[PDB]
Amino acid sequence: NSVSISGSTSVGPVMEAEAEAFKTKKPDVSIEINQIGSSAGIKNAMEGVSEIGMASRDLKGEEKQAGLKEVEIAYDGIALITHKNNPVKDLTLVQIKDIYTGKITNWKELGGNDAPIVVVSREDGSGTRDAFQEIVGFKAEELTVNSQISDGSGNIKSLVQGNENAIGYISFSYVDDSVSAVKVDGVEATPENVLNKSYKVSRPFLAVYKEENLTESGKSFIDFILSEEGQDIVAKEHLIKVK
Ligand SMILES: [Cl-]
Ligand SMILES: [Cl-]
């Protein structure tokens, strides 16, 4: 019948592409997808507000308590994006930590322009923010007080597009010619390099649900996403197919 899904903004676009193709496979099934961030999607799945929650990170310890079933539908790299005109094309993971904690505050320190770094972070509740902080190696408390907060993947892309001195983080699936992803420790931000583990900033895309709430229609949609046709859609969105 009608399958309610809510959660990650990183997963939103591939989920919409999956729903569009699934409408030709099971025409009597309707899927409603709402993008509200990973933490809210997981909470909605836990409470039965959504039949399926979308997360762009592993579940936190406190969320593991709920006993949600977890299904990996893809893997995704997190790119460090700058304005397309920034001469800096390379950052080390150590430099990324120093920028985000406010130890490095001007692009001149990174060999770029004599200009301040406009640090952009996602809102609290973002799966991308939680995975990024964990891998880069700093706590929320250590984030520079000068950081801009952008609500959702779309807004962090828009802020970086419009500010020559900005830096932000986003799913590879949102990267296009309007922004530039830096190489991290000499490694290009590609699905190949996420899969061979040389590009360290990455995370799963998960569909989470309570076994008692998942309908035959919801189960059919997850199975479609994991099928060869479902995984071809995942690759077309610059994601990594489930290994
Ligand atoms: Cl527990
Ligand atoms: Cl916030």
With contact defined as beta carbons under 8 Å apart, do 202 and 127 qualify?
no
CA 15 to ligand 2 centroid distance, Å:
25
With contact defined as beta carbons under 8 Å apart, do 169 and 78 qualify?
yes
Are the folds of 1-76+204-243 and 77-203 the same? yes
Q: Which ligand is nearest to the CA of 123?
A: 2
User: How far is the C-alpha of 45 from the C-alpha of 21, rounded, in Å?
Assistant: 24
Instruction: For the domain made up of 77-203, give the CATH fold.
Output: D-Maltodextrin-Binding Protein; domain 2 (3.40.190)
- Domain segments of the chain: what residues? 1-76+204-243, 77-203
CA 67 to ligand 1 centroid distance, Å:
8
- In the beta sheet, which residues pair with residue 52? 5
Instruction: For the domain made up of 1-76+204-243, give the CATH fold.
Output: D-Maltodextrin-Binding Protein; domain 2 (3.40.190)
Entry resolution (Å): 1.7
With contact defined as beta carbons under 8 Å apart, do 129 and 171 qualify?
no
| Chain centroid, CA 212 distance in Å | 28
Q: Determination technique for this PDB entry?
A: X-ray
Q: Which ligand is nearest to the CA of 39?
A: 2
CA 60 to ligand 2 centroid distance, Å:
18
Long-range contacts of 64-72 (CB under 8 A, 24+ apart): 66/210, 67/210, 68/42, 68/208, 68/209, 68/210, 69/208, 69/209, 69/210, 69/211, 69/214, 70/206, 70/207, 70/208, 71/206, 71/207, 71/208, 71/209, 71/222, 71/226, 72/204, 72/205, 72/206, 72/242
Which 3 state secondary structure label does DSSP give 208? strand
CA 76 to ligand 1 centroid distance, Å:
27
CA 59 to ligand 1 centroid distance, Å:
12
Q: Which ligand is nearest to the CA of 66?
A: 1
**Residues with a beta carbon under 5 angstroms from ion ligand 1:** 65
